[PDB]
Chains A and B, each alone.
Chain A
Amino acid sequence: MQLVVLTDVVERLHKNFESENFKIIALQPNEISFKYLSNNDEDDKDCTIKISTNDDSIKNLTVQLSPSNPQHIIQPFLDNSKMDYHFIFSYLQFTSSLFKALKVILNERGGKFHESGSQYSTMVNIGLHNLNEYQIVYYNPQAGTKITICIELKTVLHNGRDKIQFHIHFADVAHITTKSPAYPMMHQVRNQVFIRLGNGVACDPSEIEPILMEIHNILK
């Protein structure tokens, strides 16, 4: 029964995770160690799935994520929410590129001593509300300024069909006037970016990772 349910899970994943980075590292009766991201390490499991089997099927499929994997910040929300496993896999495949982009962003600041006295006053950390949105705010204690970038999952009607796209935009609170000392960089981002309707930027996940770096190119 354990093997049959594992085979069913693997078949469903193959149906839902058709990507060139999908691979299984270690197979265990009680846990799953498979790699679906672009992590170079062979034995590092990007996603860990614990197997809790019952007389007929798996009781619960708990998703565990490696600390090196940037996706570990969503672990408590996955743990406390009993959502469909297929839906969880769909969300993971839909947001893997976003996770890679934010991994690059956080590793830019997380680099070790490069023998440069460029002690930047801006620190990048991830703000979290729920599974529907992921938020990034730039902490500057020296200048006393904030740079909030919210990424929500909003549905938009497209050719008689509703689609979900990443809504990368500045919050409605960001009605920053020209008088702010840090306003130059928000204004530059607005001028050079603001599918753009003036405030929001809806993007295809297959194309979020270059455009976010285009936003991050100004940031870096």
Chain B
Amino acid sequence: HSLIPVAKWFVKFITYLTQEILILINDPTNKEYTLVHGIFGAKMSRTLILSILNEIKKVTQIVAKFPETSYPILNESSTFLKLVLSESPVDFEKFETFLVDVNNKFIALCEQQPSQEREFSLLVKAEIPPEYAKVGDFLLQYANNAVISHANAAAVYFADTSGLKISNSEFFNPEIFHLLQPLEEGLIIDTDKLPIKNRTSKSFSKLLYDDVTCDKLSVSEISDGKLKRCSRCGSVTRAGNIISSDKTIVPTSIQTKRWPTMYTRLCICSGMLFEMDG
């Protein structure tokens, strides 16, 4: 049951990259949307998603092979897992072949001309060197006919993929998201110089969504003071604590240690997690 909130962000993520495909075709000269090139260029990410799609098939096959029979009421979580995959706006099988074909084409190009900077460019720079300008044109042309032909073009463009918490501008509050002191004064800032409403860790970030299980944060979980913040990336998560009964399959007082207990002390970015002050 607890995997369902994670899967919502999993589907919400693949739609953002597919949305950028349609936008980039009309205007290939827009430099502000060059992030789409690097994401597909990463070599392990294409394999990593394929592995995720592989285990998703294995899990669904195993669940179909070994369903829950003693209690039909408990089949909702298993059934919902099948439904969310089928009801996705873009078919996973069509998207699976999309990344597979990119890997093969990007391997033959290495044999055509030996180069090691392109591996760095596709992973870190998220750009294509000017000497390989012809390679960039291939991504625009081929992506249109491959997967979009089996999906709703109108729906994906207007789909609500906002709130992915990808950019830093939507992590910290807009009041403090700017340079506060000149470079001569240094980079570290004493707390006393912060604005009065911005002198606490509660006002530093957007405390709306969770970062580990990708679930919406209710008012009860905000006010209990049991949530944690990462001192490195500004992430906020209530991991490592017992979840409320309303988030369980059935409201009950039984305490279960959920998987968020892995990140009790270490954040996702190897940063330290601390109890958020109230």
Residues of A within 8 A of B (CB): 154-157, 159-162, 169, 195-200, 202
Contacts and interface: CB of A to CB of B under 8 A. Distances in A.
Interface of B: 19, 22-23, 26, 32, 153-154, 157-162, 167, 169-170
A202 B160 CA distance: 16
Contacts of A159: 32
Of listed A157, A198, A200, residue having the most chain B CB within 10 A = A157
Nearest to A161: B162
Contacts of A162: 160, 162
**Across chains A and B, which 8 residue pairs bring their CB atoms closest together, nearest first?**
A157-B162, A197-B153, A198-B153, A197-B22, A154-B158, A156-B158, A197-B157, A200-B154
Contacts of A157: 19, 159-162
A160 B158 contact: no
B30 to A, nearest CB: 11
Contacts of A196: 26
Given A156-B158, A199-B154, 7 more contacts: A154-B158, A155-B158, A157-B159, A161-B162, A162-B162, A195-B26, A202-B157
A200 B32 CA distance: 23
A55 B157 CA distance: 49
Interface of B, helix, strand, loop or mixed by DSSP = helix
A47 to B, nearest CB: 31
A161 B170 CA distance: 10
B152 to A, nearest CB: 10
- Residue of B19, B26, B162 with highest tally of chain A CB at under 10 A: B162
Given A160-B169, A160-B170, A195-B26, A200 B162 contact: no
Given A160-B169, A160-B170, A197 B154 contact: yes
12 contacts: A155-B158, A156-B157, A156-B158, A157-B160, A157-B161, A160-B167, A160-B170, A195-B26, A197-B22, A198-B153, A199-B153, A200-B154
A161 B159 CA distance: 13
A18 B207 CA distance: 37
Nearest to A156: B158
Contacts of B159: 157
A198 B148 CA distance: 11
A90 B86 CA distance: 41
A154 to B, nearest CB: 5
Contacts of B161: 157
Contacts of A169: 154
Contacts of A155: 158, 160
Contacts of A197: 22, 153-154, 157
Nearest to B161: A157
Contacts of A195: 23, 26
Given A160-B162, A195-B26, A200 B170 contact: no
B162 to A, nearest CB: 5
A171 to B, nearest CB: 11
Contacts of B160: 155, 157, 162
Contacts of B154: 169, 197, 199-200
Nearest to A200: B154
